[PDB]
Structures are given as structure tokens and as C-alpha cells.
Symmetry: C4
Subunit: 255 residues, 4 copies
């Protein structure tokens, strides 16, 4: 139908994207103003009405998208499902309404590409992240058994130990705050904590560098296909294509 | 005119650059000495006169540049405008006179190239920086609503929350100073702060690596054009040129 | 023998790997539950029996591997020796039974490849690590002689100095906690500590980047050979092979 | 002369290098033992005699090198001058005798190559380091004028300000220790400190990454020439050589 295409072309336009972006910003701005404890009843009611207005615009927007694309369809995209869930959950009387400012990511294509680059880079680091998980679990069980009875606030149970070890890994007051006090009772505690810091800071660095490097490469390809409809072929492929061309030249040289 | 060219050749010489560099250093040295509270009236007046002398040399320098290049002209360069604004603002009776030591960057070509490499690398990271901005805004609104009434010094309002979250992201006393005290009242506060630290430290790393990698590549090209008048062609272009040469050889092989 | 091959094919199957993985997780879960101080005698005895059950499954597993591969043989692999030592040490009545969760690394091939990539990357950074060792030793001897008599808790002996310098390198309370107090007695102490921080943070960064970059390249090759039986040839080799092909074409062009 | 060559071949042997390495380690070990306050007079005198023995072996070693190479000659190498200065200064009755453990670097060729890679990488980062220097100087003058009268311990003079800003850049107690107290008197102090932290942490990262990347590339070339007498040609050169070969093939195709 001509109406489905007329709506699609409007939905897909820069102006419609700019209007929706401006309304997301307006909603974020009113929710930020609503954190103000000193506001009058009238000022609060006014801002709450602007929140309702912003929300209804989003319901019309999603309903226009479910029409112009179909329900099969619109829900085929992960970003449409996210946008749907975020607005639909608000119509169910979850306190943190500000999470709908995340819609800026889904609505802005360049921001959307950064996030999908980061998400697509996550499977490729799962073994490093599992190794980190294993090191933390082992260390938490050790720390609980070793220091729990003497330092219960920091190592009293598994939960307390996982928290303190996360603090230790971030190098936050690890020595003046945690290990120098522990060594007053357990003089060889550094044999546990120094190798733990060495292992975890290294692994967390590796984990983040791995994501950082992969995500940049993925986004760079997605940004190329968004502009030219294709991406740059790997240097190995270009070198392989040159080698195949040299085969035809070597063959033509004989005949 | 011959006079315009005689001045241009002087302005563009190494000696003129060295004299102006020495006067910037002299001005920086006298302003550093003027921070000394224990100085006598005579010593203070002497140094203040050396500041006036340094400033007048800069007015002559800029006036010589506006003459030898034209006003169209001299103002065509962003570094000339910056140099002009920095000296012209001093003739308007803005307390921080030391900001004129930044002129070392504009006056030294290698330092100028490092800074322009850093500035040209900024547009290419805007989506990562916006993502970081969005995460901070969302988190600040959440933190204000969650902990503002119980921890007003740290989360009392949006401003206080943005400051504390910046401190948390830098890992400064995040646990012993902020989160362990918050958990005494809100036992599940780690569900908010640990993912916030994970997200923001990762994003800030990505943002800085992105600038760091792009800026180095840009400066390396600018440093090449400064010396040889051109830069090294990308490996993809060299491989494409080889492929085009193989087309002419394959064509010549048949005929 | 047909029985040796029937067992090998079972040992090498995905199902056997999944069962052993599930039993490692079960053992880790029961040992984590045994850190709980508030557990009843019956609950403790039950979990201790589940630890015995998990351990006996591992003895059967290793015994099946020593049979199907031979003792020459099974012990030819470093991962089999590690798995053997970990289970065999438990049969010698070393308190830290949780270290057997490290078996997840040896049992999961992708996790095994990450760790062997990290280990193979270590010889190539030995000179940077030795340089770091030398800087720490020199600095520890200096710090002991300089500040030991006035600050005995932090620099009293070599051991105390090595610990404080490790804390200083990690930037943990280095100034408010260590150097500002030392400067109250030794005003030029910053001449020692600031260059030490500059040197060691740089070296530790270099050491970790070196491992991080090498380990990723090694694992990427091992992951390729695991799937395709071979890895991608270096760009230098592909370029050398193209050059050798151009020699045959230049030779054929004359004759 | 045959004697000069017989000594050179001994000096250059692995055994002579191992003996000298063992004596450097022995000297380091005795100097580390001499930090012990509780040592008896006899134990101290014994270790002091072992220090004299180690030192005399080094005088014979350097004298053998000045003979076998010549004084022109031996002093032609920067590592020989360093080794000479380190042993010659000990014969002038400078308290820190432990600095002679640095000789391990000059005596071990792989360690020597890491350090020369780091030194050769320093000129190429001078403009980034100068930019950092400029930012620190400007900020120190500002901080002294702004906060010196109200916070004299931290910003009382230029020296105190340079120290506090170095602490701020390392993110050590920057907020709980320095900026939250400063904001109690100067509520907008974050306008100064947050951009300062943003600028300096970024610049120091860039400076260290620059050295780290360049130093690795230089050492890798030096390690290649040490083993094969030459290094791997850049990918740009190999691609340029292939292009030159394609010129001769295109020329031969016509004639
Ligand atoms: C690698 C990521 C490691 C994540 C570590 C998170 C540990 C969770 C901390 C925790 O559970 N508690 C805080 C203990 O201080 C106790 C609370 O459950 C109570 O309610
Ligand atoms: C990602 C960058 C985040 C920047 C965060 C800056 C927050 C600004 C802090 C702030 O405004 N105040 C300090 C609150 O402690 C209050 C003052 O405005 C009063 O005068
Ligand atoms: C580069 C890695 C540097 C590792 C540094 C480890 C130092 C070891 C600390 C130490 O030995 N003690 C703690 C001193 O506080 C003393 C104890 O030995 C007592 O029992
Ligand atoms: C980028 C590197 C920045 C280096 C900063 C070093 C500052 C030097 C500190 C200093 O001079 N003093 C300590 C002030 O606390 C004062 C002493 O000179 C007195 O004797
Ligand atoms: Na840190
Ligand atoms: Na810290
Ligand atoms: Na700290």
C-alpha cells in the first residue's frame, strides 16, 4: 500500500529522527529536574505532565513503526524490541524512568553502531572473562577460609570476599585499607594478595583491550557499509587475489 | 611589495621563532616568580615591567604578521587567531596571564602538529564520548533519587552526583570512602556502583585509546608533509595500484 | 586394541567433557558452600561426601586416560600432568581444595588456549621483567638505607621496603599515606619517589602490553590450527611468495 | 698483536660474561645484606671485604677492556663509558653503591637492547612531553595564585603546587584528600581540577604508549641484527620493490 510506504519514508527521514531525539532529550531534562527535592507541587505536576506528553509521542512513534513495517517485521530488529520494551514497560503500573534516555543510542545511527560493535566483540573474549571469573571464585573461597574469622566485615562470607577482592583488583586502598591491617594478624598475607593483584589487573587489562580492539574494527566496517554499502576487504584477501592474478599471467606466458 | 616579502622572510625565519620562544619563556618565568608572596615591592614592580616588555614585543610581532600576510589573510589560520586573541585580551583592562605560555604550542611547529593531531582526532570519537555522557547523566539521576536523602553531601543534587560519579570512575576512594558507607544504609548499592565502574572505566579507556591511535596517525602524516611535502600512501592504495598494473600486464600478454 | 580406541573416542567426546565440566562446577559449588560458618553438622557431612564423590569421578577419569593413551604417553602433555598432580595431591593426607576448579581451564579447550597463549608469551618479556626486578631491588636497598631508621614500619628492612615500593608502584596512598609523611622528616624524598613511580609504572605497563599483544597473536594461531588444522601465514611470507612468482614470470618473459 | 686478540676473544666469551654477571649479583647480595641494622661487627667487616673483592674484579675487567680495545676505542661505546664511570666513581673517597647493580643491564645483551630501545624512542615523544611540561607549569602557577593563601601546605608555592598536581594526575586521594577540602572554601574548584585530570591523564597515557610502541619496534630490529646481522624490511619497501619488478615485466612485455 501507498500509505505504508508514505509512513516508512517519514519514519526513515532525518526530520522525524531529529524530532524524536529532541523529545528524548526533553524527557531526560524533565526527569533530571524531578530529582530536585525543593520543587513546588505546581512545578512537579507541570514536569510530570511533560513526562506523560513525551511518553505518548513515543507510543504514537512505535505504533507508526509497527504499521509501516509489520509486526513480523518491526520485531525482526533487536533495537526495535528494546525501544518497544522501554516504552511498553512504562504503561504497566519501573521507578527508573531515566533508562529511557538509552533510546538516544537506538535512535542515533552512529551511537547505535558503537554499541553494536561493543556487543559483537563480547563473544570473542568469553574465555578471558571466564578465566577472570574462575580466578575470582577460587580467590573468594580462599580469602573466606583464610581471613573470614579474623576479618569478618571484609571476608566474613563469599559475598563479602567477592566485594573486597573487586576493591583489591581496582587497587582502591588495597594496602593501607585492607592488606596492611590483615598482615598485623596474618604476616604472610602478601603471598595471597600481591599474586592476586598481579593476575587480576593483567586479566582485566587483557579483557578490556580485547573488546576495545575488536569493537573498533567491527564499528569501522559497519560505518563503511552504512555509507558505501560495503566494507574494505582484508589485506590477506587483496594479497590472495593478486596471487590468483599472477597464476593467470604465468599460464598466459606459456601459451 | 618587496617590504612585505622582506618582513615575511624574517617572520618565517628560525631566528625570529627562537627570539619569540625565548620571550614566551621569559614571560612564563616572571609570572611564576610573581606567585611568590614574600617578594618586595621593588622586585614585584621590576617583574611587572618585564611582563609589560614581553607583552609589547608580542604586539609588534602580531602587527608585523598582520602587515606581511594581510588581515584576510593572517586571520585565515586558527593558530594566528588564537595568538591574536591571547595578546589582544591582555590589552583589555583576564587575571590568568600564564595562559599565554600556551603560545609555545602555536610558535613551535612540532608542538603545534601534536595538538592539531589531537584536535582532528576528536570528531571521530564523538559517539563514544556521547555514550559516556549518556551513562553519566542516567547514573547521576539514579544516584540522586536512590541516595540523595541519606547521603546529601555526595548525592544531594544532580551536580553533587555528577562529581561523586566522576570520583567513582577514577576509582578514587570509591569503596572505603563512598560505597562501603552507602552499603551500611543500602545493602544492595554494589548492584548500582560495580556495573557503573565496569561501564565507565571501559568507555573512558576506549575514548582515550581512540584519540591516542587516531592523533598519532594524523601527526605522523602532518610531520611527513612538513618535511617532504607529501605523506606515505595507505597500504590499501599501494595494493590497489599493483592490481591496476597487473591488469595492463594481463592485457599486454594477449596482444 | 579395540578397547583402548573405544575408551579414547569416549574420553575425546563432547559429552564426556561436559560431564567432567559439570562435576568440576559441582565440586566448586560444594567447596564454596563449605566456607559457611553457620552450617549444621549434617549439611557439612553431606557436602563433604559430595566432595569425595567428585574426587573419585576424577580418579576414574585420569585412570581411564592413563589406560587409553599409555603412561609414556598421557604424561607427554603438560595439561595431563597438571590434572594428575591436582587429583593425586588430594589423595595424600593441601587444605586449598578449591585450586581443583583450575581444572576448568585444562578441561575446556578454548580456556586452555588462552592460558597457553599467556604462558608462551612470557619468555619474550623476560628482559623487561628482569629490568623491573633490578629497579625494585636497587630501590629497596636505597629506601631501607635512606628511610628505615625514621620510618621502620614501611622501610625497616628489605622485605618491608619491597612491599611499600610495590604499594607506591600501584599508586595506592603513595602521597597522602607514604611520601607526604616521609617528606616531613626528609624534605627531598620526592627526588627518590617521583622518578621511582615514573620508571616502574612505565615498565609494568610495557611488561603487561608485551604479554597482552604476544598472547593474543599466539592464541589466535592456536585457535586457527584447532579448527582448520593450520594458521594464516605472515604478511611478510605472502609478500615473499609473490616476489618469487615474479622471478618465474620475469624468467619466462625472456624465454 | 696476538695478545690483544687473545684477551678480546676472552672478554667477548660467554664464560667471562657469566663470571662478571655472578660477581655483580654477589655485590648486589652483599649490599642488600648490609642494610641489616642488627648485623655484628665481624659480619659487617666480612661483607665489606666481599664488596672490595667485587670492586677490584671490576677494575681488572675494565683495565682488560681498555687494553684489548684501546682507549679511543673502548670509550667509543656509551655502555663502556657508563661501566667505567660506575666503577671509577667508587675509587673516589657516592654512598649509593647499589647503583652498580645497573651493570647487569650493560653486561647482559638482551637487557642492554631493551634499555637502548627505550632511550632511542625518547626523542620521538619530546613534543608530547613538552606539552605535558607546559600544562603542568601553567596549572602550577594557577593553583598557587588561586589556592595558595587558603591551602598553603598543598599550594603555598610553585614547588608545593607541582607536587600536589603530580599527586592529582596519578589520581591519588585527589577528591577525598585534596579537591573536596578545597571546594569547602572554593566551590567552583572542580572547574580547574576535573579538566586538569582529563588533560594530564590523557597526555601521560599518550606519552607512555608512544614510548612503549616505538621502543618495542626498535628492540625487535636490534634483536634481529644481533642474530642474523640484518633486520626485516618495512612492508612499504617490499611493496615498492614489487612495483619496481612490475615495471621491468611491463617493459619486457612490449620488447
Ligand atoms: C568480578 C565481579 C565481582 C562482583 C562482586 C560483587 C559481590 C557482591 C557483594 C554482596 O553480595 N554483598 C556485599 C558485601 O559487602 C552482600 C549483600 O548481598 C548483602 O545484602
Ligand atoms: C564526565 C564529566 C563529569 C563532570 C562532573 C562535574 C560536576 C560539577 C560539580 C558541581 O557542580 N558542584 C560540586 C558538587 O560537589 C556544585 C557547584 O556547582 C556548587 O557551586
Ligand atoms: C615486584 C614484586 C615485589 C614483591 C614484594 C613482596 C615483599 C614481601 C613482603 C614481606 O616479606 N614482608 C611484609 C613487610 O610488610 C615481611 C614478612 O616476610 C614477615 O613475615
Ligand atoms: C611532571 C613532574 C612534576 C614534578 C614535581 C616535583 C615537585 C618538587 C616538590 C618540591 O620541590 N617540594 C615538595 C613540596 O611538597 C619542596 C622542596 O623543594 C623543599 O625542600
Ligand atoms: Na589507579
Ligand atoms: Na587510588
Ligand atoms: Na586511593
Amino acid at each position: 500500500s501507498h500509505m505504508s510506504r508514505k509512513i516508512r519514508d517519514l519514519i526513515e527521514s532525518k526530520r522525524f529522527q531529529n524530532v524524536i531525539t529532541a523529545i528524548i532529550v526533553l524527557n531526560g531534562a524533565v526527569l533530571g529536574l524531578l530529582t530536585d527535592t525543593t520543587l513546588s507541587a505546581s512545578s512537579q505536576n507541570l514536569l510530570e505532565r511533560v513526562d506523560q506528553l513525551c511518553l505518548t509521542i513515543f507510543i504514537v512513534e512505535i505504533s507508526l513503526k509497527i504499521y509501516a513495517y509489520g509486526v513480523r517485521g518491526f520485531f525482526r530488529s533487536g533495537w526495535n524490541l528494546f525501544d518497544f520494551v522501554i516504552v511498553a514497560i512504562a504503561l504497566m503500573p519501573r521507578t527508573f524512568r531515566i533508562f529511557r534516555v538509552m533510546r538516544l543510542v537506538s535512535v542515533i545511527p552512529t551511537m547505535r553502531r558503537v554499541v553494536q560493535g561493543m556487543l559483537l566483540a563480547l563473544p570473542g573474549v568469553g574465555s578471558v572473562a571466564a578465566l577472570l571469573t574462575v580466578v575470582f571464585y577460587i580467590a573468594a573461597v580462599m580469602a573466606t577460609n583464610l581471613y573470614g574469622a579474623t576479618f569478618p566485615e571484609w571476608f566474613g562470607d563469599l559475598s563479602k570476599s567477592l566485594y573486597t577482592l573487586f576493591q583489591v583488583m581496582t587497587l582502591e586502598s588495597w594496602s593501607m585499607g585492607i592488606v596492611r591491617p590483615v598482615m598485623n594478624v596474618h604476616p604472610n598475607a602478601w603471598v595471597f594478595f600481591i599474586p592476586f593483584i598481579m593476575l587480576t589487573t593483567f586479566t582485566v587489562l587483557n579483557l578490556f583491550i580485547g573488546i576495545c580492539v575488536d569493537a573498533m574494527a567491527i564499528t569501522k566496517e559497519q560505518e563503511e557499509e552504512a555509507k558505501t554499502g560495503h566494507h574494505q576487504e582484508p589485506i590477506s584477501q587483496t594479497l590472495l587475489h593478486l596471487g590468483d592474478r599472477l597464476d593467470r599471467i604465468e599460464k598466459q606466458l606459456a601459451q
